[PDB]
Amino acid sequence: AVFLGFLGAAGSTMGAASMTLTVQARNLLSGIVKLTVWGIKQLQARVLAVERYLRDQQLLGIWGCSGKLICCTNVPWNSSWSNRNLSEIWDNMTWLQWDKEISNYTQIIYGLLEESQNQQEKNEQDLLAL
Amino acid sequence: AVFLGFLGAAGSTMGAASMTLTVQARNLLSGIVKLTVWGIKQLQARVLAVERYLRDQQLLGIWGCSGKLICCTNVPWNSSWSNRNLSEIWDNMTWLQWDKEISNYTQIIYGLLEESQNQQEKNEQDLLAL
Amino acid sequence: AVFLGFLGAAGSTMGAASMTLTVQARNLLSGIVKLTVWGIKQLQARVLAVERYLRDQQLLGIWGCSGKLICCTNVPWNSSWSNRNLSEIWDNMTWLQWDKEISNYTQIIYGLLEESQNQQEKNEQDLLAL
Amino acid sequence: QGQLVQSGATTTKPGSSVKISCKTSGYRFNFYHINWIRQTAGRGPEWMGWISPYSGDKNLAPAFQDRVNMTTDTEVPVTSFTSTGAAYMEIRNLTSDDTGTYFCAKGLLRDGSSTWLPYLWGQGTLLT
Amino acid sequence: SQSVLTQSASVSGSLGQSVTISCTGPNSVCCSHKSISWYQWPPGRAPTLIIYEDNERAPGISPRFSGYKSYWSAYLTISDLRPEDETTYYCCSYTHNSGCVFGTGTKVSVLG
Numbered sequence: 317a318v319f320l321g322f323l324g325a326a327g328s329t330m331g332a333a334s335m336t337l338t339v340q341a342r343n344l345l346s347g348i349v350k351l352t353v354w355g356i357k358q359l360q361a362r363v364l365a366v367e368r369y370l371r372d373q374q375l376l377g378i379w380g381c382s383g384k385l386i387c388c389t390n391v392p393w394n395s396s397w398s399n400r401n402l403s404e405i406w407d408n409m410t411w412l413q414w415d416k417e418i419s420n421y422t423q424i425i426y427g428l429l430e431e432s433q434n435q436q437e438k439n440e441q442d443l444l445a446l
Numbered sequence: 447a448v449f450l451g452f453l454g455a456a457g458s459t460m461g462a463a464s465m466t467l468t469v470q471a472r473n474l475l476s477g478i479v480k481l482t483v484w485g486i487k488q489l490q491a492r493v494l495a496v497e498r499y500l501r502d503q504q505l506l507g508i509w510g511c512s513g514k515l516i517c518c519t520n521v522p523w524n525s526s527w528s529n530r531n532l533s534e535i536w537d538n539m540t541w542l543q544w545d546k547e548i549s550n551y552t553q554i555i556y557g558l559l560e561e562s563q564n565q566q567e568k569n570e571q572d573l574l575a576l
Numbered sequence: 577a578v579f580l581g582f583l584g585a586a587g588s589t590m591g592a593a594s595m596t597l598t599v600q601a602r603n604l605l606s607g608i609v610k611l612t613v614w615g616i617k618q619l620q621a622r623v624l625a626v627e628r629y630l631r632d633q634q635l636l637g638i639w640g641c642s643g644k645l646i647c648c649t650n651v652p653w654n655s656s657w658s659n660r661n662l663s664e665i666w667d668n669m670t671w672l673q674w675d676k677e678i679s680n681y682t683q684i685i686y687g688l689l690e691e692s693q694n695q696q697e698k699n700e701q702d703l704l705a706l
Numbered sequence: 707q708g709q710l711v712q713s714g715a716t717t718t719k720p721g722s723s724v725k726i727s728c729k730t731s732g733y734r735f736n737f738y739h740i741n742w743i744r745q746t747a748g749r750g751p752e753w754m755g756w757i758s759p760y761s762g763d764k765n766l767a768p769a770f771q772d773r774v775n776m777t778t779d780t781e782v783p784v785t786s787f788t789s790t791g792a793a794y795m796e797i798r799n800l801t802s803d804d805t806g807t808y809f810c811a812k813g814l815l816r817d818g819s820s821t822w823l824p825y826l827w828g829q830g831t832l833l834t
Numbered sequence: 835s836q837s838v839l840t841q842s843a844s845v846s847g848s849l850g851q852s853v854t855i856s857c858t859g860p861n862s863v864c865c866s867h868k869s870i871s872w873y874q875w876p877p878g879r880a881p882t883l884i885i886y887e888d889n890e891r892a893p894g895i896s897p898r899f900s901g902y903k904s905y906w907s908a909y910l911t912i913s914d915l916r917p918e919d920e921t922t923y924y925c926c927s928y929t930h931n932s933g934c935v936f937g938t939g940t941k942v943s944v945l946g
């Protein structure tokens with residue numbers, strides 16, 4: 317491997333950028349290090365940092381992906397979203413090119429992942445009722 | 447199913463309201479969208495939102511329920527808490543009626559769930575010591 | 577057991593202090609209970625509380641330990657970190673004495689735990705590709 | 707998903723050299739190899755060689771290693787994922803046996819076991 | 835010509851039927867240690883990638899074309915013949931860091 321750094325594979329293939337996720341998983345929250353200009357403006361930025369982060373953790377939690385960097389689910393890939401082959405995606409276009417093609421259907425997928433999780437712990441609720 | 451909405455089953459049975467949890471799991475944190483009246487008062491409300499949310503995630507984490515919407519545990523149901531039948535609860539009274547009857551014993555249960563988890567990862571700690 | 581309290585085993589053995597983790601897991605975030613001196617200074621402290629807490633949850637998440645109080649991993653114990661026996665640690669020195677001896681190598685270990693998790697969900701990604 | 711227009715049909719005589727161009731568009735020129743293939747009157751098709759617009763690396767058949775002059779420029783980026791590049795082609799010891807139609811070809815993928823495979827072809831250039 | 839990778843010389847077919855083109859050679863260019871790519875090639879014009887890596891089709895390639903590669907020879911089938919199929923087909927053996935070793939060619943007629 318080569319430590320490309322933060323967003324080092326932004327122009328690389330989705331198969332190469334998918335193996336370096338814990339690099340952008342650290343610097344998404346950074347860390348730790350009173351009334352003036354930047355003082356109030358720094359605290360406003362520190363709050364926004366944890367809000368956007370908890371939204372991505374809350375969304376991951378209600379999908380059953382809480383704690384996963386790569387998470388497999390039940391929702392099948394609808395051909396209307398992207399009728400592209402598996403080899404022309406992971407070894408071709410980048411994650412930036414991918415988000416533009418899925419920008420439309422990305423809201424429908426987020427709802428399919430939620431009920432696919434609620435209708436899984438509810439099934440397991442009956443699976444442990446005996 | 448019928449998309450009743452946020453808190454749509456507040457007056458419905460505990461068995462019907464338990465199948466629509468990811469609806470109130472989203473809007474508990476809402477989201478994203480500098481010195482005046484509402485400005486300071488908005489930031490005070492944005493901080494309180496993530497604090498009450500992380501308390502419910504911290505409590506869920508120390509119970510082994512981190513990531514669960516429906517979570518099964520080891521603590522047996524004490525008859526002193528509610529000596530009611532299973533059918534007269536899930537197909538009768540609502541979650542609002544339930545919280546009033548359990549408001550007393552709700553603190554004892556929260557402690558029983560914590561040590562029931564610590565005496566589970568400690569047992570599994572010995573289970574993987576060989 | 578004896579409810580020693582918050583940090584009650586700070587001077588006790590690492591084997592005795594390791595069985596009372598949910599005590600310091602609660603009071604790390606405490607909880608809930610507008611322009612003056614302490615007012616601005618309280619909100620500055622309330623934000624710092626959730627930031628240091630989410631860093632320890634973010635670090636636990638990228639290690640596969642999200643939700644664990646005791647978490648077992650794959651990284652083997654390097655003798656250069658501490659060439660001490662298992663009995664002279666868990667039944668002798670305290671967690672305070674332990675952190676001083678590992679203060680150096682503690683950053684190398686944090687990187688070994690990250691890639692040990694990414695090269696585990698990536699292996700499981702291929703394990704479920706069939 | 708872009709075009710690869712070439713030069714015209716320039717006809718010379720043996721012993722000389724001919725320059726063939728290949729102007730790209732509609733795709734990131736530095737992300738895909740540029741193969742060169744010809745179909746002469748005497749054989750079928752023959753693979754000449756490809757070159758990497760990113761690594762600048764060459765790999766060509768031994769039947770054309772001591773004849774082919776193969777170079778590329780540097781893309782003029784249009785957008786984030788679009789650019790405009792150029793690939794050049796020249797031969798050395800020319801005969802009437804090399805009379806045929808020549809085209810360039812953009813590589814297949816950006817990774818894997820078929821990174822250079824000629825996928826998107828040009829239009830054709832008739833030689834001597 | 836000096837193609838070490840032979841094909842099927844020529845073949846004929848009819849509308850609504852399926853064809854098959856062979857492609858084999860010696861142990862130096864075939865087969866289990868090399869990928870096989872098939873190319874539709876009108877006479878001296880713009881080619882087209884039909885199949886890459888033995889059996890994988892290119893983007894937009896119709897589900898009619900199929901592929902197969904035994905230890906001895908690779909086959910290109912043309913299920914359900916359509917009238918616009920008359921052309922010449924070529925195969926190529928390659929690896930990840932090599933070049934295309936093309937074939938002899940096979941003219942396919944759909945006269946029906």
Ligand SMILES: *[C@@H]1O[C@H](CO)[C@@H](O[C@@H]2O[C@H](CO)[C@@H](O[C@@H]3O[C@H](CO[C@H]4O[C@H](CO)[C@@H](O)[C@H](O[C@H]5O[C@H](CO)[C@@H](O)[C@H](O)[C@@H]5O)[C@@H]4O)[C@@H](O)[C@H](O[C@H]4O[C@H](CO)[C@@H](O)[C@H](O)[C@@H]4O)[C@@H]3O)[C@H](O)[C@H]2NC(C)=O)[C@H](O)[C@H]1NC(C)=O
Pocket residue numbers: 325327328329736737738739758759760761762763764765813815816817818819820821930931
């Ligand atoms: C930026 O974007 C560019 C363009 O997309 C990327 O460049 C492409 O990268 C991919 C993958 O890294 C390349 O695909 C591989 O191609 C090699 C072929 O290289 C071999 O042969 C070459 C010619 O004979 C030779 O030059 C190579 O030797 C080394 O020396 C050169 C000196 O210039 C050096 O630059 C090289 O890097 C080499 O190290 C080499 O011997 C092929 O072998 C690969 O197949 C292997 O790997 C795949 C998995 O990747 C595996 O499935 C196979 O089985 C096999 O094991 C692979 O196909 C592609 O050729 C590059 N160029 C293009 C597409 O034009 C670049 O990587 C991006 N960088 C970043 C940082 O994003």
Ligand SMILES: *[C@@H]1O[C@H](CO)[C@@H](O)[C@H](O)[C@H]1NC(C)=O
Pocket residue numbers: 392393394395396
């Ligand atoms: C694909 O999505 C459409 C809506 O965009 C839906 O009507 C259809 O049933 C879906 N099909 C599959 C196979 O998921």
Ligand SMILES: *[C@@H]1O[C@H](CO)[C@@H](O)[C@H](O)[C@H]1NC(C)=O
Pocket residue numbers: 416417418420
């Ligand atoms: C998304 O919707 C817009 C609506 O204007 C449309 O133009 C665009 O093509 C859609 N995206 C895709 C990938 O089709």
Ligand SMILES: *[C@@H]1O[C@H](CO)[C@@H](O)[C@H](O)[C@H]1NC(C)=O
Pocket residue numbers: 522523524525526
């Ligand atoms: C029920 O709770 C009481 C305390 O309220 C306790 O003394 C008793 O042991 C408990 N019994 C069971 C069966 O849990």
Ligand SMILES: *[C@@H]1O[C@H](CO)[C@@H](O)[C@H](O)[C@H]1NC(C)=O
Pocket residue numbers: 546547548550
């Ligand atoms: C809870 O405690 C109060 C103490 O005043 C008591 O009145 C009430 O009945 C208790 N709740 C239940 C359900 O018994």
Ligand SMILES: *[C@@H]1O[C@H](CO)[C@@H](O)[C@H](O)[C@H]1NC(C)=O
Pocket residue numbers: 652653654655656
């Ligand atoms: C121990 O750590 C050193 C670096 O401090 C490293 O070079 C060595 O390979 C490691 N050995 C083991 C067994 O982990």
Ligand SMILES: *[C@@H]1O[C@H](CO)[C@@H](O)[C@H](O)[C@H]1NC(C)=O
Pocket residue numbers: 676677678680
């Ligand atoms: C950590 O590094 C310092 C560097 O000054 C060194 O003095 C100290 O001994 C090291 N810690 C251990 C446990 O060796």
